[PDB]
Amino acid sequence: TVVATAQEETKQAPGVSIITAEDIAKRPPSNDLSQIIRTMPGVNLTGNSSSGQRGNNRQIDIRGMGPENTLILVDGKPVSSRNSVRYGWRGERDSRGDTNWVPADQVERIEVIRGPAAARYGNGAAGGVVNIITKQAGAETHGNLSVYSNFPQHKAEGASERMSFGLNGPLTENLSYRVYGNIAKTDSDDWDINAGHESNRTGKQAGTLPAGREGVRNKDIDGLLSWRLTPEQTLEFEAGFSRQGNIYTGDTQNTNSNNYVKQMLGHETNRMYRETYSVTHRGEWDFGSSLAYLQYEKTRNSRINEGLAVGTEGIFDPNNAGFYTATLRDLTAHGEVNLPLHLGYEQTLTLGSEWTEQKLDDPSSNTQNTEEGGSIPGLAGKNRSSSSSARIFSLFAEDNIELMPGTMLTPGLRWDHHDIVGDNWSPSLNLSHALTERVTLKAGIARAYKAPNLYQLNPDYLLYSRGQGCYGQSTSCYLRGNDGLKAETSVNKELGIEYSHDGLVAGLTYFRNDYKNKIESGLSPVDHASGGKGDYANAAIYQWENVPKAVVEGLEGTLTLPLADGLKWSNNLTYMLQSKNKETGDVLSVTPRYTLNSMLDWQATDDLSLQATVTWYGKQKPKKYDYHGDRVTGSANDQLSPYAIAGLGGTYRLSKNLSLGAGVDNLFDKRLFRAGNAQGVVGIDGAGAATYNEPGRTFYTSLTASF
């Protein structure tokens, strides 16, 4: 018996779930993998912002920490592409997230690491980590061709189709390849899907609509070559090219319109190019193991020009038609060695480092002039730089120690130096303790780290308001980036007990995060500008600021029953006890109060597999207060009732080479419609928690040819 690395040991911690390729095949998503990831315990499909802005662009949220705090990996390497899309006043981004980069049918598995076992992954892992692992080459040449198509009951809702392929195996003696390609379309919902369901709209804004889901068109291709240089050294080269164009269906920040909007309904209004290049060295040695990689990610965000303020705010700019391009260049270097240490206790020490650079060039975001609200000393009113960057060097040590058989202790320390923010120390401890052969106690506590994002950190990043979004006042203000921000830290702990024997599993876990210095728009003026025009002159100057304390707290439960040899009933239950910003007393992240996922899995024959699913969501309650900090009144208090979603499907194995699947999601056709943002603006009432579309009954087919 030799001990696994701390990285691998802590994948059995209470806060880890694994989604397999088999799981994905039985219950396939339309396109974005968030659809299947979201059904793990402690995981929500949530908007980026509590405002409800861009509220249909829902993403993976871990334990109510918000999708910003979900670090997404592909084959262990970070995806930062959504950082090319401007972060607004309310933490809103016009971005679908980073779970759409890999086609579902070329995924081997997905590792969902929540809470204390995630902290080790460093910057961005305060909520957790989602690591998408691709299917890799073997010793024979293998390959596949996978098609999926779905069929909404209601034609106003967007259909999806998808075709992908894999091919891999040995070219020469030392040389092997793996390639995948993928073509996909999730159509947008129709412009008027939410008509009849919208928030009350008056005057100039009469006839406006909050938008349904934005469509997407994917083109993805990857190529990996794996070169066995010696018996102890493998070198991998990998390139990836992914293109995502939208299909625009009327989405604007505040759900207002103009004719430039109406004109672009059904068109491409944003397109994302992601280019990835990585070189990876793996060593298998007499003493242990080695892994080192370099990844360069180039993200290009091309979209139609919008305004930052004054009623060109968050909508296509009719005076400045055309597109701009923001470019993100993200370079990540990593090295580590793994050391089985024999004497004393048989443990495994991991020693490593990491370096990252992020360069952002965004010509649209830093362009707010100071004509109206007055000039701000130290900030040029015009021609401010597009460019921003930050760097983080990291050291770490982790040790996985068998204290005595059945008991493992996993301490780890990560140190990080951010070139602007300064140093961070992230202590880590996870452990597992067998109480009997059937029952285990597992605990964890660690301090995760999230660096400020480049919009929050940039003193050239300026937003302006005539008064509507100003906290504690109704007169005009500025919101300014702040390069002396502290980084966010979160002390995340979990305690879990689990019974496990002959496929019966019963478990319960408690979690709590003490979330420190969450970066958010300031509450009090730190200055006032000078000059400007009329009543707007001498605007208050707010900054991006660190919120002292926030908390989330809840329970994750699991119950898996073997009803018969070919029949399994799997259940998870998550219950949210707290999610609060302790400064404003407001909500941190809007999640269902609970989520109960149930699956009935029947191996009906050798070649036939049938599945039933039910998911019960609890109540959703919106923000209590507006941008001013004042108590919200009217339909901005609206809450979503609890509801369920049921599904059925199967897979038929024609042979070892061909499988087909069919089924239906949302069997009882429960639909919800986006009515607006949380709170209103002039002419447009709020909609509270009614900020997204739940799709109705949707039939599906799939076919996988493989060898």
Pair 42, 260: CB distance under 8 Å? no
Instruction: Burial-class residue 563 by CB neighbours within 10 Å (0-12, 13-18, 19+).
Output: exposed
Q: From CA 24, how far away is CA 494, in angstroms rounded?
A: 28
Q: How far, in Å, CA of 170 to CA of 137, rounded? A: 8
Question: Helical H runs in 266-375?
Answer: none
Phi–psi pair at 87, nearest 5 degrees? -90, 120
Residue 468 CB neighbours (<10 A):
15
DSSP 40-55: STTEEEE-S-TT-TTT
The residue type of 399 is D
Q: Which residues contact 580 (CB under 8 A, 6 or more apart)?
A: 550, 551, 552, 586, 587, 588
376: number of CA atoms within 13 Å, CB side? 30
247: tokens are 């299909």
Question: Which strand (E) or helix (H) includes residue 169?
Answer: strand 160-170
Q: How was this structure determined?
A: X-ray
CA-closest candidate to residue 102, choices 180, 22, 197: 180
Token pair of 100, please? 């759409």
Tell me the helices (H) and strands (E) count for the chain, helix number first: 4, 32
HSE-CB at 193 with a 13 A cutoff on CA atoms is: 30
Helix (H) or strand (E) holding 36: helix 34-37
Could you count the other beta carbons within 10 Å of the beta carbon of residue 205?
18
What's at 482, amino acid-wise?
A: N
Look-up of token digits 């994750």: 556
3-state class of 72 per DSSP?
strand
599's tokens: 């699956």
What's the reported resolution, in angstroms, to a tenth?
2.9
Residue whose C-alpha is closest to residue 469's, from 373, 338, 610, 600: 373
Determine the Cα–Cα distance for residues 439 and 437; give it in Å rounded to an integer. Answer: 6
Nearest to 205 by CA among 257, 160, 268: 257
Taking the C-alpha atoms of residue 613 and residue 601, their distance in angstroms, rounded to an integer, is 9
Spell out a b/e string for 152-181, using b for 16 or more CB atoms within 10 Å of the CB, else e: beeebbbbbebbbbbbbebeeeeebebbbb
Quick one: which of 232, 193, 239, 199 has its CA closest to 215? Answer: 193
The edge-to-edge listing of strands for the beta sheet with 77-79 is: 16-20, 107-114, 128-134, 70-74, 77-79
Opening angle at CA 208, ends 205 and 212, nearest 5: 150
d(CA 363, CA 384): 9
Question: How far apart, in whole angstroms, are the C-alpha atoms of residue 162 and residue 263?
Answer: 28
Alpha-carbon span 40 to 112, nearest angstrom: 8
Q: DSSP code of 34? A: H
Cα-based angle 197, 203, 206 (whole degrees, multiple of 5): 30
In angstroms, the CA 133 to CA 136 distance is 9
- List of domains in the chain: 6-706 (2.40.170.20)
Residue 207: Cβ-neighbour burial (10 angstroms; 0-12, 13-18, 19+): exposed
**Is 500 exposed, middle or buried (CB count within 10 Å of its CB: 0-12, 13-18, 19+)?**
middle
Tokens 């992240």 belong to 589
β-sheet bridge partners, residue 277 = 239, 296
Residue 608 main-chain phi, psi, to 5 deg:
-120, 130
Sign of CA dihedral 627, 633, 634, 636: positive
From the CB of residue 355, how many other CB atoms can be counted at a distance below 10 Å? 15
Question: CA nearest 449: which of 123, 2, 83?
Answer: 123
Nearest to 521 by CA among 452, 579, 578, 589: 452
Tell me the C-alpha distance between 661 and 236, whole Å: 34
Could you tell me how far CA 697 lies from the centroid of its own chain? 25
C-alpha separations of 278 from 222, 234, 293, 434, 683 in Å: 11, 14, 7, 40, 50
Supply the DSSP string of 541-574, one letter for each residue. EEEEEEEEEEEEEEEEEEEEEEEETTEEEEEEEE
